[PDB]
């Protein structure tokens, strides 16, 4: 139930990527929950993918 | 806009903290009532018991 505020920005003029070296433009889509187990599961899927 | 809803979250958290404040105030009051009631009870004991000491003497 994504129901928290979105903090979004667009980053252009990138740099070489940490894990592929790709000089690829980025964009952050930030939604945070204060649930602790929810934070853990989100961390799991976010780090894994 | 969004940080304003976060300020509403802060309003709720402040209300909860103030409820903690009310509760700890209540606890302090309750303990002082403990001291007051015990003092009243033991005042009664001392008074009646010394009265009986007077009578026995």
Curated annotation (Swiss-Prot), chain A:
Gene: Atp6v0a1
Annotated function: Subunit of the V0 complex of vacuolar(H+)-ATPase (V-ATPase), a multisubunit enzyme composed of a peripheral complex (V1) that hydrolyzes ATP and a membrane integral complex (V0) that translocates protons. V-ATPase is responsible for the acidification of various organelles, such as lysosomes, endosomes, the trans-Golgi network, and secretory granules, including synaptic vesicles. In certain cell types, can be exported to the plasma membrane, where it is involved in the acidification of the extracellular environment. Required for assembly and activity of the vacuolar ATPase.
Complexes and interactors: V-ATPase is a heteromultimeric enzyme made up of two complexes: the ATP-hydrolytic V1 complex and the proton translocation V0 complex. The V1 complex consists of three catalytic AB heterodimers that form a heterohexamer, three peripheral stalks each consisting of EG heterodimers, one central rotor including subunits D and F, and the regulatory subunits C and H. The proton translocation complex V0 consists of the proton transport subunit a, a ring of proteolipid subunits c9c'', rotary subunit d, subunits e and f, and the accessory subunits ATP6AP1/Ac45 and ATP6AP2/PRR. Interacts with SPAAR.
Tissue: Predominantly expressed in neurons in the cortex and in the dentate gyrus, CA1 and CA3 regions of the hippocampus (at protein level). Expressed at lower levels in astrocytes, oligodendrocytes and microglia (at protein level). In the cerebellum, present in Purkinje and granule cells (at protein level).
Compartmental location: Cytoplasmic vesicle, Clathrin-coated vesicle membrane; Cytoplasmic vesicle, Secretory vesicle, Synaptic vesicle membrane; Melanosome
Disruption phenotype: Embryonic lethal. Knockout embryos die at 5 to 6 dpc, before gastrulation.
UniProt name for this protein: V-type proton ATPase 116 kDa subunit a 1
Family designation: Belongs to the V-ATPase 116 kDa subunit family.
UniProtKB/Swiss-Prot annotation, chain B:
Gene that this polypeptide is encoded by: Atp6v1g2
Domain of life of the source: Eukaryota
Protein name: V-type proton ATPase subunit G 2
Function in brief: Subunit of the V1 complex of vacuolar(H+)-ATPase (V-ATPase), a multisubunit enzyme composed of a peripheral complex (V1) that hydrolyzes ATP and a membrane integral complex (V0) that translocates protons. V-ATPase is responsible for acidifying and maintaining the pH of intracellular compartments and in some cell types, is targeted to the plasma membrane, where it is responsible for acidifying the extracellular environment.
Family: Belongs to the V-ATPase G subunit family.
The protein's assembly and partners: V-ATPase is a heteromultimeric enzyme made up of two complexes: the ATP-hydrolytic V1 complex and the proton translocation V0 complex. The V1 complex consists of three catalytic AB heterodimers that form a heterohexamer, three peripheral stalks each consisting of EG heterodimers, one central rotor including subunits D and F, and the regulatory subunits C and H. The proton translocation complex V0 consists of the proton transport subunit a, a ring of proteolipid subunits c9c'', rotary subunit d, subunits e and f, and the accessory subunits ATP6AP1/Ac45 and ATP6AP2/PRR.
Compartments reported by the entry: Melanosome; Cytoplasmic vesicle, Clathrin-coated vesicle membrane
Listed Basic and acidic residues bias regions: 33-53
